[PDB]
Structure 1
Amino acid sequence: AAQTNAPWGLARISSTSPGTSTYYYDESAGQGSCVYVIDTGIEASHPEFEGRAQMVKTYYYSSRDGNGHGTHCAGTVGSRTYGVAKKTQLFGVKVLDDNGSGQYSTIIAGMDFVASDKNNRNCPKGVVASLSLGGGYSSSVNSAAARLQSSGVMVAVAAGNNNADARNYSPASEPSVCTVGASDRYDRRSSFSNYGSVLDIFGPGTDILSTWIGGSTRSISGTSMATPHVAGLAAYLMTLGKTTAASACRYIADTANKGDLSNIPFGTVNLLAYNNYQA
């Protein structure tokens, strides 16, 4: 399948070269998979989600996304126009308030929620969780991410936006999950992207168009935007049967575009997520 005039990041993930604008992908499109977006919520009524999104948990007075960040990330996972895996099921877990903040204890509870809640959902092709959040190093936060991964969920986490080594941030620094840095449309490391040996992969993160609250759209930047490209890619590849939740990060690294990014510090992987789809 071909989506013309796609957002640059979608085109990038199906291309061996920057500078194109059509996204190519297998029509299975993540059908039968599920992606949890652990964030500020999801505006599930947005026409872009086509009834495939729903809120399953909140720790606050509402499950609605009063911020936009979670809706934007969910759109990159699975919206019809802005999403990688256009037929996946999206489940929102609101661990962040409408200012985008959340206590680590709430975030940990949300991860353990997903590890159990997947047993209440129909996801025959597998389960992914996208975590566009983080703060300073915490062994408890890393352990919660490790448990979620161990339970059979492909965990993708943002590297962070500090232009610093991600070893000092959580859950970015947890070895067993997939830690995602950000790149721009010219294949440069995004100016804010964290780096370091703990990164597994880069995805598009600068000037990413996606859904927003109020039934709208906007372009924003962050490792928060790169993470859902990788989460959606995992769901898509799991639906194709090419990999599993336990092996998808490694498979994405195996099949990535290699050596094509600029300003990658010595010791950080030079790997850009790629779907290897042959139309």
Structure 2
Amino acid sequence: AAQTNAPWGLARISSTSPGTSTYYYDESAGQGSCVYVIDTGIEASHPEFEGRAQMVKTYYYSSRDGNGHGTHCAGTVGSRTYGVAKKTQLFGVKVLDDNGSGQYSTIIAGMDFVASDKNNRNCPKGVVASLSLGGGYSSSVNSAAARLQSSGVMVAVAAGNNNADARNYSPASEPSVCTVGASDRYDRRSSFSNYGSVLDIFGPGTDILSTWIGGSTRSISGTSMATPHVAGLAAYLMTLGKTTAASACRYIADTANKGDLSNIPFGTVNLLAYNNYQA
């Protein structure tokens, strides 16, 4: 399948070269997979989600996304126009308030929730969790992310936005999950992207158009935007049967475009997520 005039990041993840604008993908499109977006919520009523999104947990007085960040990330995972995996099921877990803030205890609870809740959901092709959040190093946060991964969920986490080594951030620094840095449309490391040996992969993160609250759209930047590209890619590849939750991060690294990014610090992987689709 081909989506013309797609957002640059979708085109990039289906290309061996920058500078193209069509997204190519197998029409299975993540059908039968599930992606949990652990964030500020998801505006599930957005036409772009086509009934495939739903809130399943909140730790606040409402499940509404009053911020937009979670809706944007979910849109990159699985919205019809802006999403990698256009037929996946999206589950919202609101661990962040409408200012984008949350206690680590709440974030940990949301991760443990997903590890259990996936047993209440029909996801025959596999389960992914997208975590576009983080803060300073916490062994407890890292342990929760490791538990979620171990339970059989492909965990993609943002490297962080401090132009610093991700070893000092959580859950970015947990080795067993998939830690995602950000690149721009000219194949440069995004100016803010964290780096370091703990990174597994880069995805598009600068100037990413996706869904927003109020039935709207906007372009924003961050490792938060790169992470759902990788999460959606994992769901797409799991639906194709090419990999599993336990092996998807390694598979994405194995099949990535290699050596194509600039300003990658020595010791950080030079790997850009790629779907290897051949029509």
Q: 1:52 & 1:269 partners in 2: Cα distance?
A: 34
Deviation at 1:38, TM superposition (A): 0.0
Deviation at 1:36, TM superposition (A): 0.0
Q: Deviations over 1:74-106 (max 9, x none)?
A: 000000000000000000000000000000000
Q: 1:19 & 1:62 partners in 2: Cα distance?
A: 41
Q: 2:246 & 2:227 partners in 1: Cα distance?
A: 17
Q: 2:73 & 2:151 partners in 1: Cα distance?
A: 23
Q: 2:148 & 2:181 partners in 1: Cα distance?
A: 20
Q: Deviations over 1:210-264 (max 9, x none)?
A: 0000000000000000000000000000000000000000000000000000000
Deviation at 1:5, TM superposition (A): 0.2
TM-score, normalised with respect to structure 2: 1.00
Deviation at 1:160, TM superposition (A): 0.1
Q: Percent identity between the aligned chains?
A: 100
The answer to whether the aligner puts 1:262 opposite 2:262 as a matched pair is yes
Q: 1:167 & 1:222 partners in 2: Cα distance?
A: 18
Q: Deviations over 1:23-42 (max 9, x none)?
A: 00000000000000000000
Secondary structure at 1:72 match in 2: helix
TM-score, normalised with respect to structure 1: 1.00
Deviation at 1:107, TM superposition (A): 0.1
Deviation at 1:148, TM superposition (A): 0.1
Q: 1:176 & 1:36 partners in 2: Cα distance?
A: 18
The residue number in structure 2 matching 1:243 is 243
Secondary structure at 1:146 match in 2: helix
Q: 1:137 & 1:211 partners in 2: Cα distance?
A: 30
Aligned length: 279
Deviation at 1:64, TM superposition (A): 0.4
Deviation at 1:200, TM superposition (A): 0.0
Q: 1:91 & 1:11 partners in 2: Cα distance?
A: 25
Q: 1:268 & 1:248 partners in 2: Cα distance?
A: 19
Deviation at 1:136, TM superposition (A): 0.1
Secondary structure at 1:217 match in 2: strand
Q: 1:219 & 1:107 partners in 2: Cα distance?
A: 26
Secondary structure at 2:62 match in 1: coil
Q: Deviations over 1:165-208 (max 9, x none)?
A: 00000000000000000000000000000000000000000000
Map 1:125-140 onto structure 2 (within 5 A): 125-140=125-140
Q: 1:91 & 1:260 partners in 2: Cα distance?
A: 33
Q: 1:65 & 1:224 partners in 2: Cα distance?
A: 16
Q: 2:5 & 2:203 partners in 1: Cα distance?
A: 19
The residue number in structure 2 matching 1:222 is 222
Q: CA RMSD in A?
A: 0.1
List runs of 5+ in structure 1 lacking aligned partners.
none
Displacement over 3 Å in runs of 4+: none
Deviation at 1:138, TM superposition (A): 0.1
Q: 1:203 & 1:98 partners in 2: Cα distance?
A: 26
Q: 1:87 & 1:65 partners in 2: Cα distance?
A: 22
The residue number in structure 1 matching 2:154 is 154
Deviation at 1:274, TM superposition (A): 0.0
Q: Deviations over 1:104-146 (max 9, x none)?
A: 0000000000000000000000000000000000000000000
